Amino acid sequence: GKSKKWKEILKFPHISQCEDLRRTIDRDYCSLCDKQPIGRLLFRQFCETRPGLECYIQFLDSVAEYEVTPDEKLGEKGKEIMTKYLTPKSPVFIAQVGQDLVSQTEEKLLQKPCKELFSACAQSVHEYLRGEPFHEYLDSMFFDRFLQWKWLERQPVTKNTFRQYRVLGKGGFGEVCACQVRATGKMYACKRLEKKRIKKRKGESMALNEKQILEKVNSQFVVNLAYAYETKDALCLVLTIMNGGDLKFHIYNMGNPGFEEERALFYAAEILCGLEDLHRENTVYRNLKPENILLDDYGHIRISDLGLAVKIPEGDLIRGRVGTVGYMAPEVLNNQRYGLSPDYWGLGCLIYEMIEGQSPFRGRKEKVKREEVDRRVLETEEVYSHKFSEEAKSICKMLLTKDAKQRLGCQEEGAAEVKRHPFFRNMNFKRLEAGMLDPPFVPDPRAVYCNLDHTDDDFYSKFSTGSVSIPWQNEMIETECFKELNVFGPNGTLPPDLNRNHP
């Protein structure tokens, strides 16, 4: 549902408008050719024009396929790649990998195969492309086209950039609408925060905390921020739409109550991956509870309410009794100084609650005061049932270890430790992060699973930043706007917008 004249808004500017962008963008290979989706596509598109570079992109694709191939099917795939790219007389032969590297991978395949068999080769390939091909691409018409896409990216966004549809989560410190970008037709979730409440409550710093935490992290398993802007009356945050409901509804209304262990495994694996992505930014979530794990249209999950998240300074600890009764780690209830450990306590709480259909320290049918709930969280040892395997019992106990120093995942190894736990013994995290494992429950599409101060001016100047690069470029690609507008000249000739001769 793109706007009538959607091609005029995303109309490329003339290459001459991007000179300021050219002399300012950092020419980091990893950033321009990999992280940034549209940049990645354009560099790959540049490599298709050269004969000697095409085989390198094809090989990296085949390695990407190898990493997610099942175990029983690895050998075959490995041999395929070898006889295709790594044989001297192959039409698509990789040259910059040393002969002493192809013979090393020959020895590797002569034995049991591994998922990272081709990692050495792929790194050699990238070390090559990082040099001569990359700098060739910089002086190519495709980097020029990238500068055009960036110029579009940084354009100002306002209320007119989107169109609102319905309110969905009116309740918190604001409301959550269903905004939609008009030029592309992509659906999001407006997160209107009323300026007046913000100043009255004096929590402007927490608005920036959530906005900046979101803009920095980009995970498949945490709601992604795509736009932040200021409108008369409020400050909305354009976020990933989640039309599948939340985990609380599916545990209790659509559950036994509860899930089978295998189902809980899927959700816990994605949640652990979300928490790992947040922790890579030394950011603790502190608000893990079923109603904050949402489902999308496919059945995959994302962490949602980041209003309590904070970026723990590296080599530092923080203080704060925050969260929801019954989902607060003991170190928090006591107001001790903690790190990332509350999130792993929350993970324990969630796996338990999914499997058993009730909280580990409170019964669905129980009527207890916050005081006794906290006393149990701090003193009582939880009990398990035949719904848990020994492995599930184990991971829940280790994650629900009262002493954050003994708690699983709260060591130097981090999420890796939790991912190795026998509870995930049958989980291929690689295929999970690649979206290959089918989710257990698929939400039906047509379902309903339910003043004039200058100080505020600076607070907004830091909040209303605009579009987020990676999300924005991803939006362009999903809506096929990139496919449609990314059109060069007939038979590899400079299009008019990229030829400095005629503006």
Ligand SMILES: Cc1[nH]c(/C=C2\C(=O)N=C3CC=C(C(=O)N[C@H](C)c4ccccc4)C=C32)c(C)c1NC(=O)C(=O)c1ccccc1
């Ligand atoms: C689509 C959708 N998104 C969301 C919601 C979200 C989202 O998407 N991202 C995010 C990220 C962060 C939040 C978040 O922290 N807010 C808190 C409360 C807050 C704080 C301050 C001010 C306002 C709000 C919420 C969301 C909701 C409910 C539905 N609606 C349903 O779940 C629903 O009933 C339904 C079921 C089936 C089909 C259609 C609708």
